[PDB]
Scaffold this motif. Structure first.
Motif, PDB file in Angstrom:
ATOM      1  N   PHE A 435       0.859  -1.177   0.000  1.00 15.19           N
ATOM      2  CA  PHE A 435       0.000   0.000   0.000  1.00 15.19           C
ATOM      3  C   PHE A 435       0.891   1.222   0.000  1.00 15.19           C
ATOM      4  O   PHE A 435       2.125   1.137   0.039  1.00 15.19           O
ATOM      5  CB  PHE A 435      -0.947   0.048   1.207  1.00 15.19           C
ATOM      6  N   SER A 436       0.251   2.366  -0.034  1.00 19.58           N
ATOM      7  CA  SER A 436       0.995   3.584  -0.072  1.00 19.58           C
ATOM      8  C   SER A 436       0.001   4.645   0.240  1.00 19.58           C
ATOM      9  O   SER A 436      -0.721   5.110  -0.650  1.00 19.58           O
ATOM     10  CB  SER A 436       1.661   3.756  -1.427  1.00 19.58           C
ATOM     11  N   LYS A 437      -0.145   4.997   1.521  1.00 19.11           N
ATOM     12  CA  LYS A 437      -1.086   5.982   1.947  1.00 19.11           C
ATOM     13  C   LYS A 437      -0.350   7.103   2.646  1.00 19.11           C
ATOM     14  O   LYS A 437       0.445   6.835   3.559  1.00 19.11           O
ATOM     15  CB  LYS A 437      -2.100   5.401   2.889  1.00 19.11           C
ATOM     16  N   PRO A 438      -0.630   8.360   2.295  1.00 18.77           N
ATOM     17  CA  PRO A 438       0.249   9.464   2.698  1.00 18.77           C
ATOM     18  C   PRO A 438      -0.061   9.898   4.114  1.00 18.77           C
ATOM     19  O   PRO A 438      -1.069   9.510   4.714  1.00 18.77           O
ATOM     20  CB  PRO A 438      -0.047  10.601   1.706  1.00 18.77           C
ATOM     21  N   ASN A 439       0.851  10.736   4.639  1.00 17.86           N
ATOM     22  CA  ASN A 439       0.764  11.297   5.989  1.00 17.86           C
ATOM     23  C   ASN A 439       0.870  12.820   5.920  1.00 17.86           C
ATOM     24  O   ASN A 439       1.877  13.345   5.423  1.00 17.86           O
ATOM     25  CB  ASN A 439       1.874  10.707   6.881  1.00 17.86           C
ATOM     26  N   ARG A 440      -0.137  13.519   6.467  1.00 16.63           N
ATOM     27  CA  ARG A 440      -0.249  14.939   6.185  1.00 16.63           C
ATOM     28  C   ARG A 440       0.805  15.759   6.923  1.00 16.63           C
ATOM     29  O   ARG A 440       1.521  16.582   6.319  1.00 16.63           O
ATOM     30  CB  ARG A 440      -1.634  15.426   6.562  1.00 16.63           C
ATOM     31  CG  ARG A 440      -1.804  16.907   6.314  1.00 16.63           C
ATOM     32  CD  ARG A 440      -1.439  17.283   4.866  1.00 16.63           C
ATOM     33  NE  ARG A 440      -2.455  16.825   3.928  1.00 16.63           N
ATOM     34  CZ  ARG A 440      -3.593  17.477   3.693  1.00 16.63           C
ATOM     35  NH1 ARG A 440      -3.844  18.607   4.337  1.00 16.63           N
ATOM     36  NH2 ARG A 440      -4.495  16.993   2.829  1.00 16.63           N
ATOM     37  N   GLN A 479       0.468  13.518  -3.121  1.00 11.74           N
ATOM     38  CA  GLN A 479      -0.729  12.726  -3.272  1.00 11.74           C
ATOM     39  C   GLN A 479      -1.874  13.380  -2.529  1.00 11.74           C
ATOM     40  O   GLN A 479      -1.711  13.842  -1.391  1.00 11.74           O
ATOM     41  CB  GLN A 479      -0.479  11.318  -2.768  1.00 11.74           C
ATOM     42  N   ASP A 480      -3.019  13.526  -3.213  1.00 10.59           N
ATOM     43  CA  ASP A 480      -4.270  14.031  -2.638  1.00 10.59           C
ATOM     44  C   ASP A 480      -4.090  15.372  -1.981  1.00 10.59           C
ATOM     45  O   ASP A 480      -5.081  16.046  -1.605  1.00 10.59           O
ATOM     46  CB  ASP A 480      -4.860  12.981  -1.644  1.00 10.59           C
ATOM     47  N   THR A 510       1.069   9.564 -14.102  1.00 11.79           N
ATOM     48  CA  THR A 510      -0.203   8.893 -13.836  1.00 11.79           C
ATOM     49  C   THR A 510      -0.776   9.313 -12.479  1.00 11.79           C
ATOM     50  O   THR A 510      -1.979   9.602 -12.363  1.00 11.79           O
ATOM     51  CB  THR A 510      -0.024   7.384 -13.893  1.00 11.79           C
ATOM     52  N   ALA A 511       0.054   9.314 -11.423  1.00  7.86           N
ATOM     53  CA  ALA A 511      -0.447   9.793 -10.135  1.00  7.86           C
ATOM     54  C   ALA A 511      -1.131  11.116 -10.356  1.00  7.86           C
ATOM     55  O   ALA A 511      -2.342  11.281 -10.085  1.00  7.86           O
ATOM     56  CB  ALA A 511       0.692   9.950  -9.119  1.00  7.86           C
TER      57      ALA A 511
END
Ligand code: I3P
Length: 1721
Positions: A435-440, A479-480, A510-511
């Motif tokens: 996975f790869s979920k970001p941290n603000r 990201q996001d 693509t991202a």
């Protein structure tokens, strides 16, 4: 003497051949050392926070070193192993806590923790050291291991094993098993004056230098070295130190968030220096080191201002604290200067700035308090570990930039480059990722600590693991994260070239594509072409090519695309065959149908490549529908077939969501649909979670009960459906259902979509639904199972989308007209006038929607300007096809070079339903802030600033809730900061000019006065002014400038507004409004005089807006003496119809001269000036300058004594206030008003109010019409009759549980019962949507009908049952939401909750019971309801109390003309009120236990507001009540009495502090309470009968509750209010004689006893006051004795009164003495 203990914190000083304290190289590099010249004992080092260690006990490292053999294939055994590793990791914690404080003995086995690093020191037995060859490597491991154990054994024999370890002592720390003892080296390191510590038998001894005892309670105490931000209590602004102008400056920072404590910036912290003597561990002072740079704080050259200082030793940097506890909110003061800090508002070169400048002040303010907010040590280690990076790249990027870097480096930096990907994803990504979920928070750190700056500064000039190794990091960071994204598309002028460099770089783009979008496209242009020429040449399988493809998204993409087709038509060759045409392809598909490799392997490439790009075409055909010919799909395979009919549909009929009809019709039917709407709705709309939806399905399974040429393709369709069914007979949707579902998926949209584009108005597309029912139902209907659920999930949006669609608007169209059968007149079965010709014109409008501009033939001519019919029927009741009108609308957002726009467009401007349409209008809202950003970049082709404006106003003349919805944090300050950014310089001369209208429609803050424009300070805070002095400027925008100013800064609530109506223009302004503005207006327009009199109004109006706010703490005294003197100057004017809106605005500006002026006067003649003015007037009926000139004669006739100081006499002012008041019928015979009772009335109670002041002086139309009527009669009949039956069925749900029991008889233990509480937990989650709407409301309905089971037909076990099954806790958790939503139902919402609970306070307590628990989670939410009354309160009282106070008719009694339609308006007014009221009722019905009533230690818990609010309508009423109308006004009474019972259940506990605090805090409300009843009602009647029984039964019970106690203080404040002995004895002889003399009352009236259980409540209250005192013995004599006939009807009380108390054992802990109990036969 003095020892060491587990938990002491100290430092170690080596004294072998080398001397020094041990220390780290940072959080990146894990090596240990002693930098010897950094610091000795006498001269402590500089950065000594990196040489402190904590003594920790010995750690358990058994099941963690076993879980450290992840040799294992089994999964459940690794889980056991780690679970153990975990439990031990903890059991460690527990025991070590116990060993805290404990004196270490020598040869105890202690580990030594590295604080700043938090890592454990460790010898790695099995290695060589790095700089020394034989020695074992000593490093810093995070968790520790057995090689973290170190015998604290003695060095010199001055003490021995066993002996306790003293502070200071020199010892050998000797690894327990890891071999040789610690030894500080003699070898320095390659890069730094620092020696590498390693494990080797050597003669090194360690000096034990204690730092902070184990007595460091934290987080509990600010003790030195703590890290805290210093919030500002008032300025809601952190304290922050940065560079402006390359200069270090400290500042509070302004944040654009909606939560001042979330605007956390690494640049905002500070480390605590609890000053000591020796550098070591609430009364001494403290110093503050700016965490980020290293400097310390100090106020040097208000006498002093905080700013940075580079060394923390000088005595300026020394501060003290004022009320030590963590999270304390202190008032600090400067030591070397004795000043109490103080904040200013002066900030520099920027436009709308943030870094606010800070000083100090010898004067102790009170609001200047700082919250000593404490910060997460972990957070801490984050910044550290980041700095590290910044510097590592600092060296490397500085070292691979002017030359080469070594091979040692690469090894470390790449490492790093690894470690980062590790930190920033919060420890998720890394390598074969998952996975790869970001941290603000950490992303943010990347920017503000200039990690980013370094990276880029690193790339700039093998790379395979740098870039786009880097570009993968970046792909991450953006990201996001919008804020960061506006970088990764631009960052990026590189990362396209670099997007070449990496087959690993496609990912970058693509991202992008997904999240990032809009700005990318730009920089590529045909660059793309090289890349795709390149890529189509270089990506063979085209994989990179392909990810380029799926990169396709959004409309703007299709173009470059098609040109590629061109080069791609160039690229068409492939050396291979795709052919047959039916034949050899079906073969290549069998051939692929074999699982083969090589060949069958390669195939897949293409298929993929095709499906994605093909769909890449959106609603784009022709060139695609050209690109799409044969619509073949036999081997449909994966929605190829489908996407094809999809484009082939983009080729036929854009389904415009017909929706043909309108009117009350719609609603009735929705009712019919009943819950299922909901069901389906919630499932999909919500039940994002499959389950919930799944349920609404349980609902379904229950329910049970080119048209041609397109058709052809269709037939192919309905089969593949039916198919998709029998496959549905296939239950297992396992894996097959990837495929089949996927297939179905497109299909369904499609099919959904299908039905939509090819529905037809007959039983048939319908019956196709029937087969659908079968489909849906036949449509049957953790860990890996989430990824999978994904499918069934989309399987919903659509299944419901689908289900919904048909189900929705489709469901039920015919019934509508079908019941055409005839009514009253003569049969007529279907066996706004010509609505068909403006909806067939409007179909010519759908038709219109179709067109484009190249049809040079049809574009201008035929269509022309249908707007006319539009303009003509703007006036006409909106038709149903106005959203479809809006259809027409949407298109135009593209552009407008042509001029013809306006015309058709203005039809749209032509509208008569602004509120309802405008809410819809916001849609563009973002698009629009463009149209005002564009429309405003060419304004102050023309139709987007004017139509952007017309939009503005149609909104601007709209609901307060509308005004609210402007919510222009996204983006006013930019439609202002930008709209000004060009409109300030730009102003249009009279008479056409436009900057003042789009700006102006905005500030309609209730059409005056200065209230509801809070937003203005900041937006208006941040601006560039308008022009002045020598020269002159451009017309319009100035006038615009002055009033708008008023509207931004006219808030009556904040002291800015004085400095505001003063800041900039000030008093000085007056002078320039003496001459030269006529010159500017002359030059300014042909009607110059128009510009110069609007300048006179502006110059006259500074009083008007927030005029209460202008005066304030000290406005008038400043302009005292100048401005009135200055005002005579402009005393004369004329031709002022406009300038008499400037004598009515120079009668409201002229009205703003003498009100708030009690003590600043020493001047003359003002009166005569005004008076002559009022006489010299001409033109319009006096009524207005007789309400402006009559309003004058009242405001002037009240003061009496201050004005007689103002002049010799005001004798012409009573024959003019008595000609203005005597008057005639207009003043002659206009004859235009019919609410006379209300006029002469509010005038005569306003004349009774005025009296008081003086003493405190100092063939077809018939179709349309008969339709309308049968609609009314039917509507009434019908509508009225059916909803009750629907409410009973809505009650059907309430069975709820048993329901799931019956029919769904749920075997093998299924969960039929208890269906409420989880549907519950469910919906509670559901409001997370901004719009809960009627769904919510409908719930509300079903609960009050839950009250219905026991009434609408045990109840308290249903109240208490929800209670039971998820009860009370939820709803509470909920109502908080009613701020934004529910606002208009939250009222409704409230009533429903309260009913099912009340009388069953028990379940409630269960509630509370639960509630308090969230003590913190609980205590903040408090302040709310409070401010919702409160808020509801102060103002609410004002609104209708005073217009009402001038009550009707205040002219004697024996054309009643009682103003017509009063009741509807008060209901409206008492809408927000009513909210507040129902509030009261709930508040009452729950009360019971004391701690409940105790208003737990909440944040802002002052019952006080109630009193104020009560007090508020009371407000002015010290004597016998003269609000009268307001008092004689109805809705007031219900609201109150409930307040008296709720309030009454509060002082009913009779809390000594309760009864004591109330009157105090109201310090008035009370007194009023007292004052009404001794003038209890002057207006007798039904209205008065109720004013007595309330006025004395609530007063009775309440009074009673406050007084059921003993002290002395709580009695006096009420007594002095009454001439009590006489007010209560002649009110007990006038209520007891008025009430006593009749005696025709109803008997045994359980119901009311008024003037006698009341008048008797008088006699009871009195009776209760006699506990102590001498005055009360006084009023006490009369019942106490007396033969008098009134003291013998009072005697008729004392004996016919109980006049005796009941005996008290005492409740709670043997306490209070007594209180009467009625028993007075
Ligand atoms: O609305 P969004 O898209 O979430 O964006 C946030 C919004 O602009 C906040 O006002 C801002 O806080 P400040 O006004 O205090 O800068 C925050 O910055 P942050 O992420 O730097 O806190 C942004 O992320």
């Amino acid at each position: 003497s003095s020892f060491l203990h587990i938990g002491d914190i100290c430092s170690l000083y080596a004294e072998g051949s080398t001397n020094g304290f041990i220390s780290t190289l940072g959080l990146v590099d894990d090596r240990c050392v002693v930098q010897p010249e950094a610091g000795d004992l006498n001269n402590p080092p500089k950065k000594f926070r990196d040489c402190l260690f904590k003594l920790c006990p010995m750690n358990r490292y058994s099941a963690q070193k076993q879980f450290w053999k992840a040799s294992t294939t089994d999964a459940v055994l690794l889980n056991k192993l780690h679970h153990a590793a975990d439990l031990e990791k903890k059991q460690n914690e527990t025991e070590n806590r116990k060993l805290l404080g404990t004196v270490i003995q020598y040869g105890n086995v202690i580990q030594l923790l590295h604080l700043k690093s938090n890592k454990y020191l460790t010898v790695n037995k099995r290695l060589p050291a790095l700089l020394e060859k034989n020695a074992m490597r000593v490093t810093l491991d995070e968790a520790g291991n057995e090689g973290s154990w170190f015998y604290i054994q003695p060095f010199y024999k001055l003490r021995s094993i066993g002996d306790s370890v003293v502070i200071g002592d020199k010892v050998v720390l000797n690894p327990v098993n890891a071999g040789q003892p610690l030894h500080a080296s003699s070898h320095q390191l390659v890069d730094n004056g620092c020696n590498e510590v390693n494990s080797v038998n050597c003669n090194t001894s360690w000096k034990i230098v204690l730092f902070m005892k184990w007595s460091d309670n934290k987080d509990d105490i600010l003790k030195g070295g703590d890290v805290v931000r210093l919030f500002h209590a008032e300025q809601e602004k952190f304290l922050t130190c940065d560079e402006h102008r390359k200069k270090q400056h400290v500042f509070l920072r302004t944040t654009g968030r909606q939560s001042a404590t979330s605007a956390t910036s690494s640049k905002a912290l500070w480390e605590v220096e609890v000053v000591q003597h020796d550098p070591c561990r609430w009364n001494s002072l403290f110093r503050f080191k700016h965490l980020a740079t290293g400097h310390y704080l100090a106020a040097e050259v208000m006498v002093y201002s905080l700013v940075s200082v580079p060394e923390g030793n000088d005595i300026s940097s020394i501060f003290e604290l004022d009320p030590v506890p963590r999270n304390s909110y202190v008032r600090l003061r400067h030591l070397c200067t004795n000043t109490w800090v103080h904040s200013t508002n002066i900030p520099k070169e920027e436009e709308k700035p943030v870094m606010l400048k800070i000083g100090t002040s010898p004067l102790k303010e009170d609001k200047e308090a700082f919250a000593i907010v404490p910060v997460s040590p972990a957070e801490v280690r984050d910044l550290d570990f980041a700095n590290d990076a910044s510097k590592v790249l600092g060296s490397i990027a500085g070292k691979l930039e002017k030359g080469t870097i070594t091979q040692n480096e690469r090894r470390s930096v790449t490492k790093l480059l690894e470690d980062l990907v590790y930190f920033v994803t919060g420890g998720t990504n890394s390598l074969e990722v998952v996975f790869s979920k970001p941290n603000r928070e950490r992303q943010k750190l990347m920017r503000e600590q200039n990690i980013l700056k370094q990276i880029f500064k690193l790339l700039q000039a093998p790379f395979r693991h740098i870039c786009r190794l880097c570009y993968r990091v970046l792909r991450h960071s953006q990201q996001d994260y919008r804020k960061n994204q506006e970088y990764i598309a631009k960052q990026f002028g590189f990362m396209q070239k670099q997007i070449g460099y990496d087959v690993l770089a496609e990912d970058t783009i693509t991202a992008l594509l997904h999240n990032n979008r809009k700005l990318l496209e730009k920089h590529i242009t045909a660059a793309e072409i090289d890349t795709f020429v390149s890529l189509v040449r270089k990506n063979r399988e085209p994989r990179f090519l392909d990810y380029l493809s799926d990169l396709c998204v959004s409309m703007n993409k299709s173009i470059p695309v098609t040109q590629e087709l061109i080069c791609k038509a160039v690229l068409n060759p492939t050396n291979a065959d795709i052919l047959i045409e039916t034949k050899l392809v079906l073969s290549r598909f069998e051939f692929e149908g074999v699982s083969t490799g090589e060949n069958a392997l390669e195939a897949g490439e293409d298929e993929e490549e095709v499906w994605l790009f093909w769909r890449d075409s959106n609603k784009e055909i022709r060139s695609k529908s050209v690109r799409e010919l044969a619509q073949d799909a036999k081997e449909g395979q994966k929605e190829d077939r489908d996407i094809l009919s999809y484009y082939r549909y983009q080729l036929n009929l854009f389904a415009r969501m017909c929706l043909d009809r309108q009117y009350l019709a719609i609603n009735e039917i929705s009712g019919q649909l009943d819950v299922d709407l909901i069901l389906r709705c919630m499932s999909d709309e919500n039940l994002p979670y499959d389950l919930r939806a799944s349920f609404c399905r349980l609902m379904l399974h229950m329910h049970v009960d080119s048209k041609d040429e397109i058709k052809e393709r269709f037939a192919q369709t309905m089969e593949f459906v039916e198919e998709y069914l029998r496959d549905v007979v296939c239950q297992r949707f396992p894996f097959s259902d990837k495929e089949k579902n996927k297939l179905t998926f497109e299909v369904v949209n499609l099919a959904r979509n299908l039905i939509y584009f090819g529905f037809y108005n007959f039983s048939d597309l319908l019956r196709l639904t029937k087969i659908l029912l079968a489909i849906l139902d036949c449509v049957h209907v953790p860990e890996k199972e989430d990824i999978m659920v994904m499918d069934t999930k989309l399987k919903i949006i659509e299944i419901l989308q689908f289900i919904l669609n048909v189900r929705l608007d489709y469901r039920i169209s015919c019934l509508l007209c079908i019941f055409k059968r005839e009514f009253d007149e003569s049969n007529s079965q279907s066996s706004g006038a010509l609505d068909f010709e403006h909806i067939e014109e409007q179909a010519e409008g759908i038709f219109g929607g179709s067109e484009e501009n190249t049809p040079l033939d049809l574009d201008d001519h035929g269509g022309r300007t249908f707007l006319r019919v539009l303009l003509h029927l703007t006036m006409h009741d909106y038709p149903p096809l106005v959203s479809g009108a809006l259809q027409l609308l949407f298109r135009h957002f593209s552009q407008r070079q042509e001029v013809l726009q306006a015309f058709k467009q203005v039809q749209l401007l032509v509208t008569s339903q602004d509120v309802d349409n405008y809410k819809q209008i916001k849609q563009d809202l973002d698009q629009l802030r463009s149209i005002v950003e564009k429309s405003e970049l060419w304004v102050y082709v023309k139709e987007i600033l004017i139509r952007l404006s017309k939009l503005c106003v149609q909104e601007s003349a709209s609901v307060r809730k509308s005004r609210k919805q402007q919510q222009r944090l996204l983006r006013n300050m930019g439609a202002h900061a930008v709209v000004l950014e060009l409109l300030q310089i730009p102003y249009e001369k009279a008479e056409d000019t436009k900057m003042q209208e789009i700006m102006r429609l905005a500030h309609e803050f209730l059409q005056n006065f200065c209230a509801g424009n809070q937003q203005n300070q900041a937006l208006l805070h941040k601006h560039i002014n308008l022009f002045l002095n020598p020269g002159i400027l451009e017309a319009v925008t100035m006038q615009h400038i002055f009033m708008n100013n008023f509207q931004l800064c006219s808030e009556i609530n904040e002291r800015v507004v004085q400095h505001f109506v003063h800041c900039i223009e000030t008093h000085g302004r007056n002078v320039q409004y003496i001459k030269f503005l006529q010159t500017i207006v002359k030059a300014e327009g042909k009607f110059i005089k128009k510009c110069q009199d609007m300048v006179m109004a502006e110059l006259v109006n500074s009083g008007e807006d927030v005029l209460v706010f202008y005066n304030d703490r000290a406005s008038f005294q400043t302009l005292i003496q100048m401005m009135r003197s200055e005002r005579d100057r402009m005393d004369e004017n004329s031709p002022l119809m406009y300038h008499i809106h400037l004598v009515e605005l120079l009668a409201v500006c002229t009205e703003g001269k003498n009100v708030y002026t009690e003590i600043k006067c020493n001047s003359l003649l003002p009166l005569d000036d005004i008076v002559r003015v009022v006489t010299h007037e001409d033109c319009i009926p006096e009524v207005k300058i007789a309400y402006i000139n009559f309003l004058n004669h009242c405001y002037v006739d009240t003061e009496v004594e201050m004005k007689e100081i103002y002049t010799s006499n005001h004798m012409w002012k009573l024959f003019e206030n008595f000609l203005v008041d005597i008057c005639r019928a207009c003043n002659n015979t206009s004859d235009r008003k019919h609410a006379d009772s209300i006029l002469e009335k509010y005038v005569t109670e306003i004349v009774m109010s005025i009296v008081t002041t003086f003493f405190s002086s100092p063939s077809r139309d018939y179709r349309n019409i008969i339709e309308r009527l049968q609609d009314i009669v039917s509507a009434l009949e019908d509508r009225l009759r059916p909803l009750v039956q629907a409410e009973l069925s809505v009650l059907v749900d309430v069975l709820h549980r048993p329901e799931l029991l019956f029919p769904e008889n749920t075997d093998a233990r299924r969960k039929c019962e208890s269906g409420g509480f989880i549907c519950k937990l469910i919906k509670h989650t559901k409001q997370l949507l901004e719009e809960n709407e009627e769904k919510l409301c409908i719930k509300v309905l079903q609960t009050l009908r839950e009250m219905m089971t026991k009434d609408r037909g045990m109840s308290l076990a249903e109240v208490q049952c929800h209670l039971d099954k998820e009860g009370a806790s939820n709803l509470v958790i909920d109502l908080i939401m009613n701020a934004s939503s529910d606002r208009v139902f939250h009222e409704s919402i409230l009533l429903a909750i309260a009913l099912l609970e009340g009388g069953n306070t028990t379940i409630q307590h269960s509630f509370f019971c639960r509630l308090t628990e969230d003590k913190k989670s609980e205590k903040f939410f408090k302040v709310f309801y409070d401010r919702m009354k409160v808020a509801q309160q102060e103002i609410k009282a004002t609104v209708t109390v005073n217009t009402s106070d001038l009550g009707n008719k205040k002219k004697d009694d024996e054309k009643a003309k009682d103003d017509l339609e009063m009741s509807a308006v008060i209901t409206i007014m008492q809408p927000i009120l009513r909210f507040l009221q129902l509030l009261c009722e709930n508040h009452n019905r729950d009360l019971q236990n004391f701690l409940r009533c105790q208003n737990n230690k909440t944040n802002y818990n002052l019952v006080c507001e109630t009193l104020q609010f009560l007090d508020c309508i009371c407000g002015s009423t010290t004597g016998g009540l003269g609000l009268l109308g307001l008092y004689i006004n109805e809705k007031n009474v219900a609201l109150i009495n409930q307040t008296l019972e709720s309030l009454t259940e509060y002082c009913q506990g009779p809390c000594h502090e309760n009864q004591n605090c109330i009157a105090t805090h109201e310090s008035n409300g009370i007194d009023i309470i007292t004052a009404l009843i001794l003038n209890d009602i002057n207006p007798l009647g039904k209205k008065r009968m109720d004013l007595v029984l309330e006025l004395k039964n609530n007063a009775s019970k309440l009074l009673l509750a406050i007084m059921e106690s003993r002290h002395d203080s709580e009695n006096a404040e009420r007594i002095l209010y009454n001439m009590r002995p006489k007010e209560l004895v002649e009110v007990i002889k006038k209520a007891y004689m008025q009430g006593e003399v009749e005696f025709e009352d109803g008997e045994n009236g359980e119901d009311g006893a008024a003037s006698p259980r009341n008048v008797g409540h008088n006699i009871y209250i009195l009776a209760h006051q006699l506990a102590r005192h001498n005055k009360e013995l006084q009023t006490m004599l009369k019942p106490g004795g007396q033969v008098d006939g009134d003291e013998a009807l009072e005697f008729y009380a004392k004996h016919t009164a109980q006049i005796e108390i009941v005996r008290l054992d005492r409740t709670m802990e043997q306490i209070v003495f007594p209180v009467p109990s009625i028993c007075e036969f």
